[PDB]
Amino acid sequence: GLKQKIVIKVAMENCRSKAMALVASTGGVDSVALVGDLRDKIEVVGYGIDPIKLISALRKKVGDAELLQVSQA
Amino acid sequence: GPAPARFCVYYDGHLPATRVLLMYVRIGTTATITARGHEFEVEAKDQNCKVILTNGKQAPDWLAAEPY
């Protein structure tokens, strides 16, 4: 339906690559970019993405992750 | 045998030990990459993951992609 943008800050100090591939492999994702000065944030764009499941998988497999933004932009 | 790649993965650089990871783009979609302070709108066309600007022009030599 509506195009999403989701930004997640992830603690990933290999860890960046892992985090990015997990996000790419999530349902509904069209793109995944590293953003921020420290390249410690992930911007996800797509449709019908479930942010709750996405945050728990990141926390499960990679490290602490928190939602910075969710916008149906 | 493996499924066809679903994404093209873009890098600034061609060498695994030094390249910088930029973005994953779903094959069949277009996305805007930000790199070296500029924007590049790419089309991830297929599993060969040629770097393709949506305006038909030549992309910079340093922009590389491979299938995931």
Residue numbers in the entry:
A (entry chain A): 186 to 198, 201 to 260
B (entry chain B): 18 to 85
Provide the publication's sentences verbatim.
Two paired rice NLR immune receptors are known that contain an integrated heavy metal-associated (HMA) domain, Pik-1/Pik-2 and RGA5/RGA4. M. oryzae secretes a large repertoire of effector proteins, and many of these, including the structurally characterized AVR–Pizt, AVR–Pia, AVR–Pik, AVR1–CO39, and AVR–Pib, share a conserved structure comprising a six-stranded β-sandwich known as the MAX (Magnaporthe Avrs and ToxB-like) fold. Direct interaction between the Pik–HMA domain and AVR–Pik is required for triggering an immune response to the effector. Here, we reveal that Pikp is able to trigger partial disease resistance to the “mis-matched” effector AVR–Pia in rice and elicits a weak cell death response in Nicotiana benthamiana.
To visualize the interface formed between Pikp–HMA and AVR–Pia, and compare it to that with AVR–Pik, we purified the complex between these proteins and determined the structure to 1.9 Å resolution using X-ray crystallography. Pikp–HMA comprises two adjacent α-helices opposite a four-stranded β-sheet. Previous structures of AVR–Pia were determined by NMR spectroscopy, and the crystal structure determined here is very similar (0.92 Å over 65 aligned residues), comprising the six-stranded β-sandwich characteristic of MAX effectors. As observed previously, a disulfide bond is formed between residues Cys-25 and Cys-66. Whereas Pikp–HMA binds AVR–PikD opposite the face of its β-sheet, it binds AVR–Pia adjacent to α-1 and β-2. Another striking feature is that whereas Pikp–HMA is a dimer in the structure with AVR–PikD, it is a monomer with AVR–Pia. The interface formed between Pikp–HMA and AVR–Pia covers an area of 460 Å2 (as calculated by PISA), approximately half of that seen between Pikp–HMA and AVR–PikD (986 Å2 (12)). Furthermore, the interface between Pikp–HMA and AVR–Pia is dominated by hydrogen bonds between the peptide backbone, with the main contributions derived from Pikp–HMAAsp-217, Pikp–HMAVal-219, AVR–PiaTyr-41, and AVR–PiaArg-43. Intriguingly, although Pikp–HMA binds AVR–Pia at a different interface to AVR–PikD, it uses the same interface that RGA5–HMA uses to bind AVR1–CO39 (29).
